[PDB]
UniProtKB/TrEMBL annotation, chain A:
Organism: Avian paramyxovirus 1 (NDV)
UniProt GO MF annotations: ATP binding; GTPase activity; mRNA 5'-cap (guanine-N7-)-methyltransferase activity; RNA-directed RNA polymerase activity
Protein name as annotated: RNA-directed RNA polymerase L
Principal location: virion
Gene name per UniProt: L
Taxonomic lineage: Viruses, Riboviria, Orthornavirae, Negarnaviricota, Haploviricotina
Compartments where located: Virion; Host cytoplasm
Keywords: ATP-binding, Host cytoplasm, Hydrolase, Methyltransferase, mRNA capping, mRNA processing, Multifunctional enzyme, Nucleotide-binding, Nucleotidyltransferase, RNA-directed RNA polymerase, S-adenosyl-L-methionine, Transferase, Viral RNA replication, Virion
Cysteines joined through disulfide linkages: 1071-1276, 1116-1119
Key word Nucleotide-binding present: yes
TrEMBL record, chain B:
Signal peptide: none
Superkingdom of this protein's organism: Viruses
Species: Avian paramyxovirus 1
Protein name (record): Phosphoprotein
Gene name tied to this protein: P
Length: 1310, 71, 76, 68, 158
């Protein structure tokens, strides 16, 4: 049945591994359990005599499998039942020969692909790079030996260690997914698959996978997600073993990883579940191996020794002491000898042994220990921190409101200094906050800050799972597993228990009425609140009302109070990190009072941070904000609710073990529970705690008389203690003063965090003069330290759970390959690695598919070549162009796809039939609505992605029962038709502009409805509800299921297998933007009528320029050919790219790229774009007023004066490693025309070619390197069109608008 | 007779209005800083009262001095 | 005889004790404030829960449940 | 003949007042300085020396036992 | 003039009469009552001798009986705190400022670790190769915690 082929079972692990789920399907089948589960608390307590008398398909498969496995193992001995991770070394080396043959079928075809196409992939990479680096380099053009080993071994993916088990686990994974899908539909088919591997049998069901070994008479059982975990880890460590062995600066890691894997697997058999404590230490060794390379002897070798002592101290509790010695010696040998980058690389080994099995009991003990614990804080240190808290609020409100203090209760200003500073309304310095802390801690405030409860609205449209109330709490568990007296208490879920849905069905939702759940203390009257804790290793299940007040308080702190503390958000979390690490001693060592400043760094480890807060410590800090908002009791709700409530750890398969647990107010502080949780919950109330920690960091900076540039997101505190030194001072004095200041500050920071109740450790934290850690990225000496091998472990072979989607699965691989090229790998390696992996992807989906056609085109090898190499805009699968390797996706996509097809034809990869069939392709549907909603595009015939279809369907289903007073004008009866009519009005003119019409409709209220609809949380459990309450249909769902087939056949029909005798007038030797404009015009021609769709295309940055490195004599053969329009790129000679930074030219931060309601800004954006596009006359202003009238409530005489200038206004992932891009000089003088979009890309192209000159095996430079990117002799130099103004023919649509909504309208006339 | 009592009078009046008036502004400023060091006693006791969850309805818009005088 | 400028310097000298005895009753009144304020504090600290061995000044979680049965009050 | 009686009453008045005011105004100073020294001992034993206990329920007893 | 000055002088010295006789018996009694009211605050703040590890985390418990400043702790939380006091009245804190029911928990090197770390320092830091071979050669000869430390401070100085 087709209903059960949409929400597919997932292919990769995105869930915790629960132990007692697996033990339920172990006890439910007939097998004997392991020895470490004999006295278990859930196994001994349940009434299995009723549980085994249901005879659902959930149990009968397990009964037949318990009969089936038991036959191929004898009765002569005892059957050992090894439980994960004690079975890691076996399943690590699993060898099914069947799946090995089934993948070597694919291997043979990939070897055919290399034998047919390897030399044109050589010709491409040796022609494009030759073109961009000129004929002064055409004797220095040799391919990298990452590409060459990829070329001689095409089957890299098949001929490594771990491959023979990677085959096996991918095969068992796809079989179990197919068995789940086939078990969805009610049937009585063969629900069992037996495979045969070297010494034993493998049993596959919807739930379990059971692997047996017959010579040792053992067997292991795996739950549904545990085979996902093994399947992820095998291709993870095998792809690590591929990348770290074919890359020249990484081959020395290849043994060092293959040791440390195969070592710790051997430690799995006896350590067991505790071996992940050894896995959790593997990060600290990669830190300490960077810390071994300090400039001075201090701080070098401290944390490496600490982790080595901790590794010994954990192994000696379990091992013989000789084995702990030998193992510790081995670990210390592996992590020594490594460079800076090669010790950043060993952070890949984190997920590479998998995840420990979880349970509610042992994860509730670790919360009762540190949350129901007594504390004793210092009141006189609370006052010293609260001094800086109130002082920072005073200075933030002063700087925000033009030099005015907040509304102080004026009878509470004590002392002659603070009354003086109020009377002047000046800025408190930190010294006065330290000295006068008794006077400044007691200052009060009045209601001077007016909040806004629903500020963001994206955080209310999240799908956060909501606990059902405490009279129904046993509905959190499987009703199969509750006992009979506890089955009497579960009621039915009328709600969906989602914050996404129950917010939209919320009749009578007023924000200010709902904050009175807190300020009036009714939330603590409320005897229905139950909180539920998650199984993890940050999330909790609250009730509805309490979660709403949680999100509101987060929003109010996040917008009003938190930016007072400087906020220490995409590039501002890496400009304020890369320039912060310019403050190390080694970044500025050419030069080596008040002329230079340097820093040293502390990245700290606070023990159990979020749950060591108490009401006693945060009450006064909350009090200073309840006063500043005019609120009686708002921001201390967390501790006062958790003191009076009892919460538990939430897992279905982990019920309470005692069968006499009915009510939460009677359970003991025991098995799964926490009674009177004094501490916080991670993630919740994060803003207030971050602000208290900033106040404490600044307090300790003042108590040792130093300056600190901290950054903290919780307990991820990174402190840069600075010191300003002389240019003519000795280096030993500099590195002495820094270490003295670091010791003083660290001592005081220990001291001020100890007295508020927070252990930051002396040894666990990482002090260094050189590097620091932020979001698991190590910043060291003004560069970011490489993470290629973390990204290689995420390189996988299925991406998506909504259909058998090959297009999104090739897009995932394309992005991860581009990410490896950013971390520093060659271009020719990564592009051809993308080609080979998209080949493996498209053959992997033909076989192994869990939806049983494709046999026509799947053996056509030049079709599969031309399919994963043609860009996805033109129809194929290659999202990764050759240009995306050099720069970022700014610019027009269509010209780039045609430039790639022009290059692929010019070298001989892609056939000359295929470009001409693109140029002769029949058009698609074509809409004014679609061309407005998606410019840059083509009107080729295409099928819609199941992600887009199902997301849009869920957005339309959830806003059906939308009944809250807020966001009431979001879903109307004709919100489609206004978009259609507005697109028809904007677009159909004398000169069609798609981009500016996209800008206008995005600015008007139609795009506002789109933007607010696009904030809902489309998880899969939301898509399941929106399909179970309004089904997708018959034709759309058949387009969902057969999406990859229809896409592949559509590329085959339209552009590959096609004749197209009426070839057009456009040639193939022209500039590609001509062909993109021809294809846009011819494609939209049944809709446009013949008018030029213009104002879209940009040049391709690679195609435009013909670069040239200068020779020795100076002056280029391109600039001696009669050309002076170029860009000047200079690189100074003799740059050591390593620790010895003595004589480097000045390293700088490299090139990266009011006071109104934003409705008014969107309105003025609409007016500006409309007037600059269609001319400036009062007929245009008549409609532009009507469009801006939709958002705001101003009149025509304000728009003509408030209209901005006619403009171009229509960590996580760093853009690269920065090695020579901090040392390169840019001069855009001679390109007299393009001094916008073109030069922003030409700069990044030049700075990517410069660092593409030097690999990761080169630490020095030897010449000055100059580039002249000449572009006057180019085919793509075309004159900008003459803007001939006209008048918008017709009248704008009515654009009806509700005035009640603050999210969509601004009634105040500005 | 009148001149001797007159000069004894002015000697007594002169030196004692030297030293009493010398003594007064000193003790005046000390009773001043007793005020601003006794006000923060009530302020810190109002801070200490509201940390206990037995007093959570003591709404924050009130005065910490007034919570010291709350009883 | 003439005792004129002697009386004039007496008129000069009485202004010092004028301003200082003018300041005297304000100091006396502020001693009256400090007495009552210190009395309020020694009334308060006798009923706070400073810990001794014996532990009779304990509050439970029932005080949080009992006191939070109302809209929060204003003491100022 | 009247100013004699006037200054005779006057000198004993002025001296009696200001002599019975000197020997109070100076012990006033030493006593108030002793009292400023006295209150700083409460400025430390109440302010600096003060620690805040929360008897966290690190035991096994139900919430209805903790609601007692 | 005699009379016009004598009237104002008599009036102002009567102002001084009204100063003194009201100033003395009131202000001196009020500051005696003020001192008897501050001493009763001083005598109601029962110290308890908190015995933190702080950062100096040495053994020999009596040292933390020695370095232990007294503190008047204030119960600001529900429940019974009595299993965290001592016969004698002293409360020992954790590193997380947690009281502990028995204060013996506060006070609770090898040679392979130190050799491993100094080998990592020699192999990993920038160094001439023969000097690295020399310091590795005179490191397997070492036999105590001392003189590995000599190599450690010899390697970090080149």
């Amino acid at each position: 049945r087709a209903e059960h082929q949409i929400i597919l079972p997932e292919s990769h692990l995105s869930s915790p591994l629960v132990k007692h789920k697996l033990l339920y399907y172990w006890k439910l089948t007939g097998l004997p359990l392991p020895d470490e589960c004999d006295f278990d608390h859930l196994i001994l307590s349940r009434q299995w005599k009723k549980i085994l008398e249901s005879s659902t398909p959930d149990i009968e498969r397990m009964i037949k499998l318990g009969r089936s496995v038991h036959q191929t193992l004898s009765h002569s001995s005892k059957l050992t039942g090894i439980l994960h991770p004690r079975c890691l070394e076996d399943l690590v080396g699993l060898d099914i020969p069947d799946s090995t043959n089934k993948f070597r079928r694919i291997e043979k075809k990939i070897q055919i692909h290399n034998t047919r196409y390897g030399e044109p992939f050589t010709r491409l990479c040796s022609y494009v790079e030759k073109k961009l680096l000129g004929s002064s380099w055409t004797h220095k053009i040799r391919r990298s030996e990452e590409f060459d080993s990829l070329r001689t071994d095409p089957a890299f993916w098949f001929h490594s260690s771990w491959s023979t088990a990677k085959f096996a686990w991918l095969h068992v994974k796809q079989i179990q997914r197919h068995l789940i899908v086939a078990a969805r539909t009610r049937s009585a088919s063969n629900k069992l698959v037996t495979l045969s591997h070297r010494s034993g049998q493998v049993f596959i069901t919807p739930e379990l996978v059971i692997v047996t070994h017959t010579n040792e008479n053992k067997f292991t059982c795996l739950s549904q997600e545990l085979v996902l975990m093994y399947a992820d880890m095998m291709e993870g460590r095998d792809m690590v073993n591929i990348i770290s062995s074919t890359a020249v600066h990484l081959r020395c890691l290849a043994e060092k990883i293959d040791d440390i894997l195969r070592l710790v697997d051997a430690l799995a058999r006896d350590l067991g579940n505790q071996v992940y404590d050894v896995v959790a230490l593997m990060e600290g060794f990669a830190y300490g191996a960077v810390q071994l390379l300090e400039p001075s002897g201090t701080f070098a070798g401290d944390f490496f020794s600490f982790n080595l002592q901790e590794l010994r101290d954990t192994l000696i509790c379990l091992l013989p002491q000789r084995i702990a010695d030998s193992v510790t010696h081995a670990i210390a040998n592996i992590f020594s000898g490594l460079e800076q980058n090669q010790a950043a690389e060993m952070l890949c080994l984190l997920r590479l042994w998998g995840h420990p099995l979880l349970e509610s009991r042992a994860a509730a003990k670790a919360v009762r220990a540190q949350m129901c614990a007594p504390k004793m804080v210092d009141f006189d240190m609370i006052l010293q921190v609260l001094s800086f808290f109130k002082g920072t609020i005073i200075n933030g409100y002063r700087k925000k409101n033009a030099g005015v203090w907040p509304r102080v209760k004026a009878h509470t200003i004590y002392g002659n200094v603070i009354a003086q500073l109020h009377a002047d309304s000046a800025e408190i310095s930190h010294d006065i906050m330290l000295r006068e802390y008794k006077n400044l801690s007691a200052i009060e405030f009045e209601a001077c800050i007016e909040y806004d409860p629903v500020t963001n609205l994206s955080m209310f449209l999240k799908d956060k799972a909501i606990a059902h109330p405490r009279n129904n709490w046993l509905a959190s568990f499987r009703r199969n597993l509750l006992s009979e007296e506890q089955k009497k208490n579960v009621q039915d879920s009328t709600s969906t228990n989602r914050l996404l849905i129950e917010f939209l069905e919320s009749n009578d939702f007023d924000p200010y009425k709902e904050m009175e759940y807190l300020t009036t203390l009714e939330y603590l009257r409320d005897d229905s609140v139950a909180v539920s804790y998650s199984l993890k290793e940050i999330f909790a299940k609250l009730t509805k009302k309490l979660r709403n007040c949680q999100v509101m308080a987060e929003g109010i702190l996040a917008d009003q109070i938190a930016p007072f503390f400087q906020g220490n958000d995409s590039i501002s979390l890496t400009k304020s990190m890369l320039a912060m690490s310019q403050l190390s001693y080694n970044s500025n060592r050419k030069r080596i009072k008040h002329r230079r400043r340097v820093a040293t760094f502390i990245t700290t480890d606070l023990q159990k941070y979020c749950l060591n807060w108490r009401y006693q410590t945060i009450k006064l800090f909350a009090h200073a904000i309840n006063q500043l908002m005019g609120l009686p009791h708002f921001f201390e709700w967390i501790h006062l609710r958790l003191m009076d409530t009892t919460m538990f750890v939430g897992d279905p398969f982990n019920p309470p073990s005692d069968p006499t647990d009915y009510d939460l107010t009677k359970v003991p502080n025991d098995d799964i529970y926490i009674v009177s949780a004094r501490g916080g919950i991670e993630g919740l109330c994060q803003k207030l705690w971050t602000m208290i920690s900033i106040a404490a960091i600044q307090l300790a900076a003042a108590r040792s008389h130093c300056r600190v540039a901290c950054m903290v997101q919780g307990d991820n505190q990174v402190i840069a203690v600075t010191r300003e030194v002389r240019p003519d001072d000795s280096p030993e004095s500099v590195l002495t003063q820094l270490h003295e200041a670091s010791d003083n500050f660290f001592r005081e920071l220990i001291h001020v965090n100890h007295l508020i109740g927070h252990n930051l450790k002396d040894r666990e934290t990482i002090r260094s003069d050189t590097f620091f850690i932020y979001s698991k990225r190590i910043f060291k000496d003004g560069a970011i330290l490489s993470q290629v091998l973390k990204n290689s472990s995420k390189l996988v072979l299925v991406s998506g759970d909504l259909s058998e989607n090959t297009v999104m699965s090739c897009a995932n691989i394309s992005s991860t390959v581009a990410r490896l090229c950013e971390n520093g790998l060659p271009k020719d390696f990564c592009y051809y690695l993308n080609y080979l992996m998209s080949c493996i992807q498209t053959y992997f989906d033909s076989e192994f598919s869990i939806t049983s056609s494709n046999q026509s085109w799947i053996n056509d090898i030049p079709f599969i070549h031309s399919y994963v190499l043609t860009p996805a805009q033109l129809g194929g699968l290659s999202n990764l162009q050759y240009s995306r390797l050099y720069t970022r996706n700014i610019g027009d996509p269509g010209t780039t796809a045609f430039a790639e097809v022009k290059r692929l034809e010019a070298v001989g990869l892609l056939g000359p039939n295929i470009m001409t069939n693109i140029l002769t392709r029949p058009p698609g549907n074509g809409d004014w609505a679609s061309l407005c909603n998606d410019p840059y595009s083509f009107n080729f015939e295409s099928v819609a992605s199941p992600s887009i279809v199902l997301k849009k369907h869920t957005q339309r289903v959830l806003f059906e029962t939308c009944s809250n007073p807020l966001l009431s004008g979001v879903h109307t009866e004709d919100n489609e038709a206004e978009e259609k009519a507005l697109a028809e009005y904007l677009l159909n003119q004398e000169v069609i502009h798609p981009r500016v019409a996209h800008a206008i409709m995005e600015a008007s209220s139609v795009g506002r409805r789109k933007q607010i609809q696009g904030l809902v949380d489309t998880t899969n459990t939301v898509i399941k509800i929106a399909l179970s309450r309004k089904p997708l249909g018959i034709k759309r769902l058949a387009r969902i299921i057969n999406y990859s087939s229809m896409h592949a056949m559509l590329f085959r029909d339209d552009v590959f297998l096609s004749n197209r005798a009426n070839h057009p007038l456009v040639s193939s030797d022209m500039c590609s933007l001509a062909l993109a404009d021809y294809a846009r015009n011819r494609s939209w021609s049944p809709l446009t009528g013949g008018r030029k769709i213009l104002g879209v295309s940009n040049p391709d940055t690679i195609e435009l320029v013909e670069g040239e490195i200068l020779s020795i004599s100076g002056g280029c053969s391109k600039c001696d050919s009669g050309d002076e329009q170029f860009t000047w790129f200079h690189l100074p000679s003799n740059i050591e790219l390593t620790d010895d930074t003595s004589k480097n030219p000045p390293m700088r931060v490299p090139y990266l790229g009011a006071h109104m309601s934003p409705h008014v800004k969107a309105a003025l954006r609409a007016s500006s774009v409309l007037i600059w596009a269609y001319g400036d006359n009062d007929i245009n202003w008549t409609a532009a007023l009507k469009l801006a009238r939709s958002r705001c409530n101003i009149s025509s005489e304000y728009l003509r004066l408030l209209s901005p200038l006619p403009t171009a206004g229509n960590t996580f992932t760093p853009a690269s490693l920065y090695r020579v891009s901090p040392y390169v000089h840019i001069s855009n003088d001679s390109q007299r025309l393009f001094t916008n979009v073109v030069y922003q890309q030409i700069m990044l192209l030049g700075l990517s070619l410069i660092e593409s000159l030097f690999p990761m095996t080169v630490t020095k430079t030897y010449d000055e390197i100059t580039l002249h990117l000449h572009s006057k002799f180019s085919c793509c130099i075309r004159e900008a069109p003459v803007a001939v103004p006209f008048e918008l023919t017709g009248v704008a649509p009515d654009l009806r608008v509700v005035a009640s909504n603050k999210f969509m309208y601004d009634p105040n006339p500005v | 007779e009148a001149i001797s009592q007159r000069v004894s009078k002015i000697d007594y009046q002169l030196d004692l209005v030297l030293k009493q008036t010398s003594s007064i502004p000193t003790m005046r400023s000390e009773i001043q800083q007793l005020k601003t060091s006794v006000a923060v006693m009530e302020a810190n006791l109002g801070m200490m009262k509201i940390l206990d969850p037995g007093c959570a309805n003591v709404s924050s818009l009130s005065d910490l001095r007034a919570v010291a005088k709350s009883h």
